[PDB]
Scaffold this active site. Sequence first.
Site: not given
Lengths: 125, 125
Positions: B7, B69, B44, B112
């Site tokens: 994850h 990123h 969360e 992105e």
Amino acid sequence: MISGLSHITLIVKDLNKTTAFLQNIFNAEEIYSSSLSKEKFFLIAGLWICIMEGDSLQERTYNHIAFQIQSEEVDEYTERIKALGVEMKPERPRVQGEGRSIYFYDFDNHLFELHAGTLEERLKR
Amino acid sequence: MISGLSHITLIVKDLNKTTAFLQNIFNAEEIYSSGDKTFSLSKEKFFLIAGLWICIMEGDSLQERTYNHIAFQIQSEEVDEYTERIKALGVEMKPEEGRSIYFYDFDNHLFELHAGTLEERLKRY
């Protein structure tokens, strides 16, 4: 719609030193080397990872990526990490259904996690 | 051996705002939510994005922007679409048609959306 994950990009001050770190710990497979800047592409467990050399440095935080490993592998990965002298976090508190994890850094404040749990197990809510 | 990505964890200052952000752009699917302020348990949520498990925890935003990123994959035909989609959310976009889109969430995270595959990127042979 989003098809899936394209790749993850990290910035490090010393590319050759990071390369060794990735190759040793993650069995990373370098598939490309520089260009706009100095960079290398690695394949880590199917994931396209991009490493670029730059002086940028993010302050340390819990923002991180975690890779999947098996429970019977936590110790071996722990020995591997200790051997390279990389910094390792202590046992993090967890709830039932949340599997074991080991956390360690690279040389540029990047926290990495090796998780031995499953999303399904954490869905006993 | 590392079998894959488990994850990706992101720390954000306001989950509700971030949640909507993830839903509007990535069609993020919420599958878990915990937290109890009267019990000193930070909140969360778990989201699924194109099969990927993304975890969001409430805490401080990055205190600076860096080029590290995460890039998500899309189609070339969908570039103009997401560009407008992202503009409509009012978040900052780096002007860097088109093949890749860059933008920040509300916590200095740089994302992105990339059109094109790894194979395509390395066709230079």
